[PDB]
Write a protein that binds this ligand. Structure first.
Ligand SMILES: *[C@@H]1O[C@H](CO[C@@H]2O[C@@H](C)[C@@H](O)[C@@H](O)[C@@H]2O)[C@@H](O[C@@H]2O[C@H](CO)[C@@H](O)[C@H](O)[C@H]2NC(C)=O)[C@H](O)[C@H]1NC(C)=O
Ligand SMILES: *[C@@H]1O[C@H](CO)[C@@H](O[C@@H]2O[C@H](CO)[C@@H](O)[C@H](O)[C@H]2NC(C)=O)[C@H](O)[C@H]1NC(C)=O
Ligand SMILES: *[C@@H]1O[C@H](CO)[C@@H](O[C@@H]2O[C@H](CO)[C@@H](O)[C@H](O)[C@H]2NC(C)=O)[C@H](O)[C@H]1NC(C)=O
Ligand SMILES: *[C@@H]1O[C@H](CO)[C@@H](O[C@@H]2O[C@H](CO)[C@@H](O)[C@H](O)[C@H]2NC(C)=O)[C@H](O)[C@H]1NC(C)=O
Ligand SMILES: *[C@@H]1O[C@H](CO)[C@@H](O)[C@H](O)[C@H]1NC(C)=O
Ligand SMILES: *[C@@H]1O[C@H](CO)[C@@H](O)[C@H](O)[C@H]1NC(C)=O
Lengths: 41, 320, 238
């Protein structure tokens, strides 16, 4: 059964970048992304 | 952003008066228009905040060890020993810029709506932007955050301004010391040299002035015998009372219209400012800008965001 | 090409299913229609007169008594027109700002490649394509997004012969045993060489400099050529 619920906003996932003195992350792949922007003229 | 306000025509113009409300029905949908305009302004304020600050996919955290190549970010990193984990500079800003007049405004149909994002969420967003930009550089703004040592990121930025990276690697302690001195002087020059930080206070003052003038226009007779609806209703028969009621309705309708038009113009100005702040967050914080004087005076290295009451503060780190 | 074709095929769904935008143009249309409807609906308000119809007032009263009702109607309708025009001016200012932004986006995303972050989509902007929409424009932004990141050990510089070597364009990476030079946005490891590195000072300055071998193509080629020269000599001399 569905009902109306209230909650506190989630600002997003929690991520900790594995920062180190000498650690680097390098991409080995890629993606071509086609996004859309609509603008009133 | 600016303060969201809500105005009740019936309460402001003909407060709990049935005769005046029945007379006000004869002016059509002026109040539907006023309410619609104010609601648009408020939703636009929330949109402004969302576009400026919600620019991170994830809430990035800095690692428990706060060594970043010798750089002192403690005055801009969040302070966990606080209810709101605002930084040192953010707390200074919130204390200096501070938001009975308020009760009296609230007493005649003029209410203030709380913003959708609390100061804690704005601080969270700014902290996530800071952690992303110091633990990953400009990678988090173009995909997943890729960690890189801060000295090597600074070497990237020196390459980006046209200086070979060995100049940073062979002057790393000096550059760190200069950055630490400048970031320590920021806490004084932000509130002593003035210059800016008057824009946010000016926004607050303009909103308060508009509300005060709107609620002070209730004391004008506008040609009637008295400015109090109860007095007119008590001292006259309906046929003779409608004239005074109509004078008051015309004056108060005009005051409301003026308030809403000024609010619309001011909200347009604030939306322009918020679009500029969003572009600055994208191009100065999430990346390194080659546009001259867009991210400070000099060759832009990086930028750091801080949240302020109804606005944002950019600390631009540049090479001179 | 396949990734671009897949994304451009998903555009035809995500443009009208995910919503997000495309509500701005409809909102413009709805605001204009609402303004016009309210303006023409304000003609039914008496504004304190006996009736909202001019013909009725003109038919039911002599001129001296009619002018009062006519003036009430004139004041109300003048106010309605003024409100409509002021709202239209403010909205047209907003639309002019939006159109200036769209013109800048056409110049800098379609007619060229933009280095401004998030100006032409999320990611590293490759290109953009325009489409016309009722009262507006749609930009299809084609961007490059790094996909499969991996950990590596990294160094700011390499020390070989008491000299510090820095990458000409790239970063030094190590999987754990060997050191390569890779470009920063795509893992393409290359042997560290005097060609892709430049020497600056000694190894006592850079914090985090590591020891490794930087290979000189001139020396290796000279040694290999001298080996063949020695073989050619020994062919007939010895
Ligand atoms: C990097 O190397 C230097 C120099 O060592 C020489 O080159 C090496 C690649 C290897 O072939 C060594 O046998 C060579 O001697 C190192 O400096 C040496 O440090 C040790 C230990 O402290 C000391 O006994 C030597 O005298 C040093 N040699 C010189 C010429 O100063 C240096 O430690 C190496 N770096 C790292 C991070 O290990
Ligand atoms: C780079 O990413 C692409 C896209 O995900 C990978 O190509 C896919 O490879 C799998 C495995 O063979 C196929 O099933 C998919 O059909 C491929 N996708 C496309 C669009 O062709 C590619 O393998 C990745 N490269 C590396 C080195 O991991
Ligand atoms: C990164 O390296 C730095 C030094 O180059 C480390 O900082 C030192 O940490 C030790 C304990 O780990 C302390 O005793 C020193 O006082 C620290 N030095 C300075 C100058 O702060 C740092 O811990 C290393 N690790 C990380 C994850 O940053
Ligand atoms: C980073 O900055 C903080 C604050 O700017 C420094 O903390 C100060 O340290 C001195 C020396 O012990 C104290 O007298 C101050 O009271 C501290 N300030 C605060 C606000 O706590 C800190 O030392 C800096 N870190 C480094 C590594 O230089
Ligand atoms: C990089 O290393 C950290 C530490 O183990 C790990 O959490 C992270 O997932 C690694 N990144 C990748 C892409 O493997
Ligand atoms: C690092 O890459 C090189 C090049 O293929 C390889 O020879 C070496 O074994 C690699 N090291 C590890 C730990 O995989």
């Amino acid at each position: 059964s569905q009902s109306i619920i209230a909650y506190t906003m989630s600002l997003g996932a929690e991520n900790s970048v594995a920062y180190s003195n000498n650690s680097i992350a390098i991409p080995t792949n890629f993606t071509i992304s086609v996004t859309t922007e609509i603008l009133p003229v | 952003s600016m303060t969201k306000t809500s105005v009740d025509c019936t309460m402001y113009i003909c407060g709990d008066s049935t005769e005046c409300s029945n007379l006000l029905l004869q002016y059509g949908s002026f109040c539907t228009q006023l309410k619609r305009a104010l609601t648009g302004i408020a939703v636009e304020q929330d949109k402004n905040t969302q576009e400026v600050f919600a620019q991170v996919k994830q809430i990035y955290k800095t690692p428990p060890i706060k060594y970043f190549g010798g750089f002192n970010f403690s005055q801009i990193l969040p302070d966990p020993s606080k209810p709101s984990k605002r930084s040192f500079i953010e707390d200074l800003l919130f204390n200096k810029v501070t938001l009975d007049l308020i009760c009296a405004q609230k007493f005649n149909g003029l209410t203030v709506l709380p913003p959708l994002l609390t100061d804690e969420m704005i601080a969270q967003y700014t902290s996530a932007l800071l952690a992303g930009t110091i633990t990953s550089g400009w990678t988090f703004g173009a995909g997943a955050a890729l960690q890189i040592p801060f000295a090597m990121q600074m070497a990237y930025r020196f390459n980006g301004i046209g200086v070979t990276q060995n100049v940073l690697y062979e002057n790393q302690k000096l550059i760190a010391n200069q950055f630490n001195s400048a970031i320590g002087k920021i806490q004084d020059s932000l509130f002593s040299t003035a210059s800016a930080l008057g824009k946010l206070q000016d926004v607050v003052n303009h909103n308060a002035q508009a509300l005060n003038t709107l609620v002070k226009q209730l004391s004008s007779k506008f040609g009637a015998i008295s400015s109090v609806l109860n007095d007119i209703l008590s001292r006259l028969d309906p046929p003779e009372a409608e004239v005074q009621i109509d004078r008051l309705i015309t004056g108060r309708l005009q005051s409301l219209q003026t308030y809403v038009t000024q609010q619309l113009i001011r909200a347009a100005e604030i939306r322009a400012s918020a679009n500029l702040a969003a572009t600055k967050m994208s191009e100065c914080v999430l990346g390194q800008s080659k546009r001259v004087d867009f991210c400070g005076k000099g060759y832009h290295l990086m930028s750091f965001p801080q949240s302020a009451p109804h606005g944002v503060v950019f600390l631009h780190v540049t090479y001179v | 090409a396949n990734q671009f074709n897949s994304a451009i095929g998903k555009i035809q769904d995500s443009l009208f299913s995910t919503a997000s935008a495309l509500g701005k143009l409809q909102d413009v249309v709805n605001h204009n229609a609402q303004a016009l409807n309210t303006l023409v609906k304000q003609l039914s308000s008496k504004f304190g007169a006996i009736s909202s119809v001019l013909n009725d007032i003109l038919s039911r009263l002599d001129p001296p008594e009619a002018e009062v009702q006519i003036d009430r109607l004139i004041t109300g309708r003048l106010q309605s027109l003024q409100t409509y025009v002021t709202q239209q001016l403010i909205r047209a200012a907003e639309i002019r700002a939006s159109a200036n932004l769209a013109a800048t986006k056409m110049s800098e995303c379609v007619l060229g490649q933009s280095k401004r972050v998030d100006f032409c989509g999320k990611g590293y902007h490759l290109m953009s394509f325009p489409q016309s929409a009722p009262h507006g424009v749609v930009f299809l932004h084609v961007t490059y997004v790094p996909a499969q990141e991996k950990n590596f050990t990294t160094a700011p510089a390499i020390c070989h012969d008491g000299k510090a070597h820095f990458p000409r364009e790239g970063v030094f990476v190590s999987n754990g045993t060997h050191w390569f030079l890779t470009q920063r946005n795509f893992y393409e490891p290359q042997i560290i060489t005097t060609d892709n590195t430049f020497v600056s000072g000694n190894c006592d300055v850079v914090i985090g400099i590591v020891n490794n071998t930087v290979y000189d193509p001139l020396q290796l080629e000279l040694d290999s050529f001298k080996e063949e020269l020695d073989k050619y000599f020994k062919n007939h001399t010895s």
